[PDB]
Design goal:
This is part of a larger assembly, with chains A, B, C, D, E and F. By secondary structure, chain A is mainly α. Chain A contains two helices and no strands. Chain D is globular, with a radius of gyration of 28 Å. The chains are: A mainly alpha, B mainly alpha, C alpha+beta, D alpha/beta, E mainly alpha, F mainly alpha. Chain F: This is 26S proteasome non-ATPase regulatory subunit 1.
Chain lengths: 60, 896, 165, 396, 58, 68
């Protein structure tokens, strides 16, 4: 745990420095859930990937 | 506001009519105020009558609604009008009529504003108004109870008015009997019992009792209301001094003994401390109610219920006096006589031993300090009476082996283990009495006193045996005999017991140093009854201090006896004092001072005031030192006052120890040592916290003997909850070892606390109320202030002898078993309005068997819905019976 | 009535004055509270130290142990520390634990949740009583049920019914 | 007096100023010490502080496999779900820790000092529990026909197993109490519980359902077992359509979470073992949701229907309730009950309650005829239509 | 600063869960002008949503 | 100066606060009819240390010869 949003920022950043560059996600689902349980550590972690994603989208 | 309503004829105006007395009315306000004064009475008399009817009607309409906005300002504006000049002056009929709704208007203000000022003011107006109206208040209340609807607010208001009457500001006896209190008691139990308690209105309730018994039975709880009147009465010492209350308790006691609820009567006779009162509580029950029922029985049952100190029957003022009245009471001469004899209360205790089992594992091991240590331990494991029988029978190990003072100590503690035997313990003491040195025989005598109380009740008395013994020329045997005498009678007034004390210790010249205990024994007899008034104890104490104050033990005991002999009364001390003055010394001046304090003592505010002008924080040589600790305890007072005052006492007990330490530095160690016993006397509302807190610290501070004192209270309710507490204490003691001398004190502490399961709990309370007296706690109490406690003093200090009887269930219609009996439990409680604290007789059924407890047992009551009955004896099981009174002369509640 | 007020007051005067009197005076004179009283204050304060992990008291066990679940992701079956009482830890309240070795130093916090905050709603309404006209009967019915036993429960529970609700 | 009054106001400030000194000595806030029991405990307590017995981390032992390097080791899995291999602290023997049993290990030094009491992991179930409650015996209707039938099964083995063995009858197991809300399944069960005087744990199943699927199931087995071990236990399972609902799925939902727990209860009652003599009572809100395993005799020997209390019952509930109450006695209590339509038990009582209220309202020492008529005419019209029973009964 | 958790310096910025939420959802760019032809709609919406939050006083 | 002497004087000053405090508190002004409170009679303790005086005098420069 904790590493999952940290990954997203760096990979997404690589694109920005060497711009224009395309970030292509194969299947955005298993992460793009509109529902999280958010009570077990497992659910919390998926919820943290989505949270980073949205922030990062404006960042590009 | 909304002017007009009833002063307007149209159909429409009826809605404004309710509202209108809040602002102003056209003529209706004026009718009592303006129109009555300005015009002359007779011209005006026709109009006022018509309008009178309408104000009555408005009252009824306002009750119809549930609103306070419409109720309160409306009745208030109307009052002022009445006050002015329709009070008594209009005519003979018209003031009675105006005065009837006036009462109604008054209640809301009286009740709502609580203050002292408001309180006195309302009484002034109510009393004058009551006299003139002449009994209309009684009809008014009854109509209001019936009504069609009323407010919840009003429930509190109507009772409050009854308080204006009780003051007698303008009354003196006219309408001092009921404002229709009877329905009023039934609905709500709150303010009304206070009013009743002060008035002496309580007489009328006996006449009323016949009607009330139905409501008390299954329908309501009228029973709670009378028990409350009793709480207010005892509380009245705290509210206003002992001399003021004393007159009051006498008049209250006569109405209660006449009433069917006997425990309330029993509490008040026990407080006054008189011979006459006791025989009357016994006889009165039988006479007032002629039906056999419980009524004949209540006299004996109340004496058994009374638990304050000592053995069977406990007070023992009552045991001698109840004979002669015995013959008159006549359930049967042969049976009533046998039930009253302490031979029947002994047998039941035998059964409880079986349940408790052996706890004994203690030292009985020979040679050294351990031999002395062993003797105190054997009793301490099985405190009161348990299965310690094996050890006591065995003479050879513990009793005989000791040397010097140790022999007296060994023998003295023996009686306390043998406690509550008819005979067979007496056989055992007699066998020692004959053998060995003087120390064995004398020690045997305290112990003798204990076992022989078992056959008594004015046929073969305890007195009879002790009378021969006292005569002995040797100092030691005679001392032990008087000490033994004091132990048996406890606090009685009897011709013989007083007579044996009259010549004994007629000198301050004595061989032993324990001669002083004679004075204490004498002191004990005086309290818990009408005083002894013995010459020997008074005259000698002043001479003793002048020859010697070098012996810290000797010097202390004689003035302690003087201070106790005087307690019990103020009046009596005067006769003895008068004598003392003949011999004048500087010592005597101090003796005189003690009499002021003694007479004033037990007051709830006088005693407190006295302690600024103290004899602590002073030494005149060391004269002042001896009684100064005694004053500070206030221990009698603490037990004497109500269950309500106990909550307060938990701080008081601590407060008194603090006071000694501040005043006197040397006195500080002593004060802590007294503390363990102080709590034992006190029997406070919550028992758990105080001794445990003390128990750990008492190892560190010099004199480990404090810890030994602590252990006596410390076991509290015998192990179910206490299992953690008794194990931890014992460990703290045993854990630290530094010397054989230290080990022995700590060893006494470990073993006392460590009591096997389901055993007789520490008590000097009644077991309905924490009301009582102590003149047996005194025997350790006195000896716990002797500087570096000797082997000889330890011996005096060892006895318990005050703890519970095993029967806490039906005495009833002649049962007297330990064999199970059903009880009811209420999961839903309503009551905190009963002093004793027994919840509703509406019952939910549960299994049989109530056995000894100290604290709790309050929700435990006896079924009264199984065939519908009400408890005479308010049930908790501490030393409260599960017994009921019903019309039938046999219990409809059959043994489980 | 007035006399009662004096009795109630009687318990309370003694409670403040006694606590004040005993703490200062008894450390000063002999060895009663003395070394022991300092010892409790000091030991708890040192163990607690910096930091303390917060936990919640799930349950109390009768053998001087308790089930605390700590806010660090680990549950503990703690041992009680010398001079702290097991039986002053409410099941409603959360307890504070020393975070080096898990023992209950004490309760400085009872803690608070957003879950509490839903139930508790404070009302101070624009329209209230006497801002409603008509349908007068309907208000009186409500009150006999709700207001009258709530204010004075004593008769209603006493008569034998459960209070009308 | 005036002096005394001043102190009332004052004591509140005086306690607040003093508050750091109160806190240390008595308890709560800064330096929590009770002074009465932690003082006594202090000497024992010193042993635990010195050791690494603090921490003693929550765990359960999977297997007690000992192995080399440090010889006395146990394989434990903590309640948060990760395993550690630990050591034995000398203060117990390897005998004390046993496979499947709950155990304490440190977090700083992983080793067992004292084993942790097994199976008391639900706190949620405990929340509801009041041992031996009951409103009052009078509202029941006292002895009804319904109460007496319930005692033969329930009271009698708990009170005496001796009589059972003597005659040679197998001891009963299950009583299934059913009817729509307010026919008093719980009220009668409380009454028999008190009488037998067995320890009484009633519990709502809705707290033995918590978090996800399978956690609630762990709670039900451990609780049940614990009670079973205990001699003379009575368990009244209160309202189960929350561990007692229908069994299906349709693959757009699913009853699963509910069924895992329900099935776990059913299994445990008799067991795959003969049976105990510890009683189970089940209260269900539907007779329409029950699967056959629950219904087998030896997990349910006789079915008793407490639905819409009987012809005798309607009158007893009013008179025994009326007896307790201060009411008029020129009205026939049975006439008021009889008027009541298809009455649920809750509904009969509703008349008494409404009747009494009017009487309290007046503040009379009885009641009047008027209070009764308004109550009863009101109950017959409105309440009966609006009972639980019209809707539920047709379904059932 | 770790193993004591004693405070160093205050970071002047405030953090609540609500501030991050606002950023992630992202407010639109589109002006009411751009949207227009819904001119009749911008008046109707304005009165109920906007006016009481701006001045609840009126 | 050496500390040894200084410790002795600190303990001697303390005795005074303890003795006045003792008598004063003991007097009940909250269990007699009059209540003026007994909590206002809360005194505290004192001690005595000493250390050599610093006082720069006759200084033209820090440590010249100190010209008179």
């Amino acid at each position: 745990l904790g590493e999952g949003p940290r990954m997203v920022r760096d990979v997404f950043r690589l694109a920005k420095e060497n711009a224009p560059a395309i970030i292509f996600i194969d299947e955005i689902d298993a992460i793009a859930t509109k529902r999280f349980d958010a009570q077990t550590g497992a659910d919390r972690e998926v919820q943290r990937i989505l949270l980073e994603l949205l922030n990062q989208m404006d960042g590009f | 506001m909304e002017e007009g309503g009833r002063d307007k004829t149209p159909v429409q105006s009826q809605q404004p009519s309710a509202t209108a007395p809040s602002g102003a009315d056209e003529k209706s306000s004026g009718k009592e105020r303006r129109d009555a004064g300005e015009k002359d009475k007779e011209q005006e008399l026709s109009e006022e009558d018509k309008q009178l009817q309408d104000e009555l009607e408005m009252l009824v309409e306002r009750l119809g609604e549930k609103d306070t906005s419409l109720y309160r300002p409306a009745l208030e504006e109307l009052r002022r009008q009445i006050r002015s000049s329709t009070t008594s002056m209009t005519s003979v009929p018209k003031p009675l009529k105006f005065l009837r709704p006036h009462y109604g208007k008054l209640k809301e203000i009286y009740e709502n504003m609580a203050p002292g000022e408001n309180k006195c003011f309302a009484a002034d107006i109510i009393s004058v108004l009551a006299m003139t109206m002449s009994g209309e208040r009684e009809c008014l209340k009854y109509r209001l109870v019936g009504s069609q609807e009323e407010l919840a607010s009003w429930g509190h208001e109507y009772v409050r008015h009854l308080a204006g009457e009780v003051a007698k500001e303008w009354q003196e006896l006219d309408d001092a009997e009921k404002a229709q209190r009877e329905p009023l008691l039934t609905l709500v139990k709150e303010i009304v019992p206070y009013n009743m308690a002060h008035n002496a209105e309580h007489e009328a309730c006996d006449l009323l009792m016949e009607i009330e018994q139905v409501d008390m039975l299954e329908k309501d709880i009228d029973e709670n209301a009378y028990s409350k009147v009793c709480l207010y009465l005892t509380s009245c010492v705290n509210y206003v001094p002992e001399p003021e209350n004393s007159a009051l308790l006498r008049c209250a006691l006569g109405v209660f003994r006449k009433f069917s609820r006997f425990p309330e009567a029993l509490r008040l006779a026990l407080m006054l401390n008189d011979m006459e009162l006791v025989e009357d509580i016994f006889t009165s029950c039988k006479d007032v109610v002629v039906q056999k029922q419980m009524a004949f029985m209540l006299g004996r049952h109340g004496v058994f219920l009374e638990l304050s100190e000592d053995v069977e029957e406990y007070e023992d003022l009552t045991e001698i006096m109840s004979n002669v009245q015995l013959n008159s009471n006549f359930l049967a001469l042969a049976r009533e006589l046998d039930i009253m004899e302490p031979k029947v209360p002994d047998d039941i205790y035998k059964t409880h031993l079986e349940n408790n089992r052996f706890g004994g594992s203690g030292s009985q091991v020979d040679s050294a300090r351990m031999n002395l240590a062993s003797s105190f331990v054997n009793g301490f494991v099985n405190a009161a009476f348990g299965q310690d029988k094996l050890l006591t029978d065995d003479g050879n190990k513990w009793l005989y082996k000791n040397k010097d003072h140790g022999m007296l100590s060994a023998a003295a503690s023996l009686g306390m283990i043998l406690l509550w035997d008819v005979d067979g313990g007496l056989t055992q003491i007699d066998k020692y009495l004959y053998s060995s040195e003087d120390y064995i025989k004398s020690g045997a005598l305290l112990a003798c006193g204990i076992v022989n109380s078992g056959v008594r009740n004015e046929c073969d008395p305890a007195l009879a045996l002790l009378s021969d013994y006292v005569l002995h020329n040797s100092n030691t045997m005679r001392l032990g005999s008087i000490f033994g005498l004091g132990l048996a009678y406890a606090g009685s007034n009897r011709e013989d017991v007083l007579t044996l004390l009259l010549p004994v210790m007629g000198d301050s010249k004595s061989s032993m140093e324990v001669a002083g205990v004679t004075a204490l024994a004498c002191g004990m007899i005086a309290v818990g009854s009408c005083n002894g008034d013995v010459t020997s104890t008074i005259l000698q104490t002043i001479m003793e201090k002048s020859e010697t104050e070098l012996k810290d033990t000797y010097a202390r005991w004689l003035p302690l006896g003087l201070g106790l002999n005087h307690l019990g009364k103020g009046e009596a001390i005067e006769a003895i004092l008068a004598a003392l003055e003949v011999v004048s010394e500087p010592f005597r001046s101090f003796a005189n001072t003690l009499v002021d304090v003694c007479a004033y003592a037990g007051s709830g505010n006088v005693l407190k005031v006295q302690q600024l002008l103290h004899i602590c924080s002073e030494h005149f040589d060391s004269k002042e030192k001896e009684e100064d600790k005694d004053k500070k305890e206030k221990k009698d007072k603490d037990k004497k006052e109500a269950p309500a005052d106990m909550g307060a006492h938990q701080g008081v007990a601590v407060l008194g120890i603090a006071l000694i330490a501040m005043g006197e530095e040397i006195g500080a160690e002593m004060a802590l040592r007294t503390f363990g016993h102080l709590l034992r006397y006190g029997e406070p509302t919550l028992r758990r916290a105080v001794p445990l807190a003390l128990a750990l610290i008492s190892v560190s501070n010099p004199r480990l003997n404090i810890l030994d004192t602590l252990s006596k209270f410390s076991h509290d309710a015998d192990p179910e909850v206490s299992y953690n507490s008794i194990f931890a204490m014992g460990m703290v003691g045993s854990g630290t070892n530094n010397a054989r001398l230290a080990a022995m004190l700590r060893q006494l502490a470990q073993y006392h606390a460590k009591d096997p399961n389901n055993l007789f709990m520490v008590r000097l309370a009644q077991g309905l109320t924490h009301l009582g007296k102590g003149t047996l706690t005194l025997c350790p109490y006195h000896s716990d202030r002797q500087l570096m406690s000797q082997v000889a003093v330890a011996g005096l200090l060892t006895v318990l002898v005050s703890f519970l009887d095993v029967r806490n269930i039906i005495l009833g219609k002649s049962h007297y078993v330990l064999y199970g009996l059903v009880a009811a439990m209420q999961p839903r409680m309503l009551v905190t309005f009963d002093e004793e604290l027994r919840p509703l007789p509406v019952s939910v059924r549960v299994g049989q068997a109530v056995d000894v407890v100290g604290q709790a047992g309050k929700p435990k009551t006896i079924t009264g819905f199984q065939t519908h009955t009400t408890p005479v004896l308010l049930a908790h099981g501490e030393r409260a019976e599960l017994a009921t009174e019903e019309f039938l002369p046999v219990t409809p509640i059959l043994e489980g | 009535t007035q006399c009662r007020l004096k009795l109630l007051k009687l318990e309370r005067i003694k409670d403040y004055l006694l606590m004040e009197e005993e703490f200062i005076r008894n450390q000063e004179q002999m060895k009663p509270l003395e070394e022991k009283q300092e010892e409790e204050r000091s030991k708890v304060d040192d163990l607690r130290g910096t930091p303390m992990s917060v936990g919640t008291l799930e349950e109390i066990i009768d053998d001087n142990h308790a089930i605390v679940s700590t806010s660090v992701g680990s549950e503990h079956y703690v041992s009680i520390l010398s001079f702290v009482d097991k039986d002053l830890l409410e099941p409603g309240c959360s307890v504070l634990l020393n975070h080096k070795v898990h023992a209950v130093i004490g309760v400085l916090m009872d803690d608070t949740d957003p879950l509490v905050t839903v139930m508790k709603v404070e009302k101070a309404p624009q329209e209230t009583y006497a801002d409603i006209g008509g349908l007068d009967n309907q208000i009186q019915e409500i009150k006999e049920s709700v207001e009258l036993p709530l204010t004075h429960p004593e008769y209603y529970e006493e008569m034998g019914i459960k209070p009308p609700k | 007096q005036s002096t005394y009054s001043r102190q009332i106001k004052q004591v509140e400030d005086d306690i607040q100023q003093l508050l750091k000194k109160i806190n240390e000595l008595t308890g709560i806030k800064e330096s929590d010490t009770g002074l009465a029991p932690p003082a006594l405990w202090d000497l024992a307590a010193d042993k635990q502080t010195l050791q690494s017995e603090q921490p003693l981390q929550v765990a359960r032992c999977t297997k007690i496999i000992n192995a080399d390097s440090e010889d006395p080791k146990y394989i434990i899995n903590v309640k948060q779900f990760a395993k550690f291999v630990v050591d034995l602290s000398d203060q117990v023997a390897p005998t004390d820790i046993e496979e499947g049993m709950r155990v304490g290990v440190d977090r700083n030094k992983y080793q067992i000092h004292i084993p942790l009491p097994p199976k008391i992991d639900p706190t949620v179930t405990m929340m509801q529990v009041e041992e031996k409650p009951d409103v009052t015996y009078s509202d029941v209707g006292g002895c009804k026909e319904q109460i007496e039938k319930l005692r033969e099964v329930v009271e009698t083995p708990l009170l005496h197993p001796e009589r059972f063995v003597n005659l040679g009858i197998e001891p009963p197991k299950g009583v299934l109490l059913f009817g729509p809300p307010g026919t008093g399944k719980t009220l009668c069960a409380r009454a028999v519980a008190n009488r037998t005087d067995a320890c009484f744990i009633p519990v709502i199943g809705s707290e033995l359902v918590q978090k996800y699927v399978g956690e609630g199931a762990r709670m039900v087995r451990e609780l049940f077992e614990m009670a079973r071990t205990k001699k003379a236990c009575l368990i009244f399972f209160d309202e189960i359509d929350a561990i007692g609902g229908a069994r299906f799925d349709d693959g757009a939902g699913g009853d699963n979470e509910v069924q895992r727990t329900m099935l776990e209860l059913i299994n445990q009652l008799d067991g795959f073992d003969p049976r105990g003599n510890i009683k189970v009572l089940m209260a269900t809100n539907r007779p329409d949701t029950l699967d056959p395993a629950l219904m087998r005799p030896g997990r349910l020997d006789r079915k008793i229907e407490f639905s819409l209390p009987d012809l005798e019952g309607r009158t007893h509930i009013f008179k025994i309730h009326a007896r307790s109450m201060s009411v008029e006695r020129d009205i026939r209590f049975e006439l008021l009950a009889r008027l009541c339509p298809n009455s649920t038990g809750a509904e009969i009582r509703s008349v008494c309650t409404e009747a009494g209220m009017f009487a309290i309202r007046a503040r009379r020492k009885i009641a009047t005829e008027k209070d009764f008529l308004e109550a009863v005419n009101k109950v017959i019209k409105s309440y009966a239509k609006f009972s639980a029973t019209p809707r539920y009964m047709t379904y059932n | 600063r770790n193993d004591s958790y004693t405070l160093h310096k205050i970071l002047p910025n405030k953090v609540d869960p609500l501030v991050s939420l606002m950023m992630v959802e992202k407010v639109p760019d589109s002006t009411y002008e751009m949207i227009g032809g819904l001119d009749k709609q911008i008046k109707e919406i304005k009165e109920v949503i906007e006016l009481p939050v701006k001045h609840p006083e009126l | 100066e050496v500390p040894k002497e200084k410790e002795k004087e600190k303990v001697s000053t303390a005795v005074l606060s303890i003795t006045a405090k003792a008598k004063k508190k003991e007097k009940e002004k909250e269990k007699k009819e009059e209540e003026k409170m007994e909590v206002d009679e809360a005194e505290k303790k004192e001690e005595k240390e000493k250390k050599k005086e610093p006082e720069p005098n006759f200084q033209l420069l820090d440590n010249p010869a100190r010209v008179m």
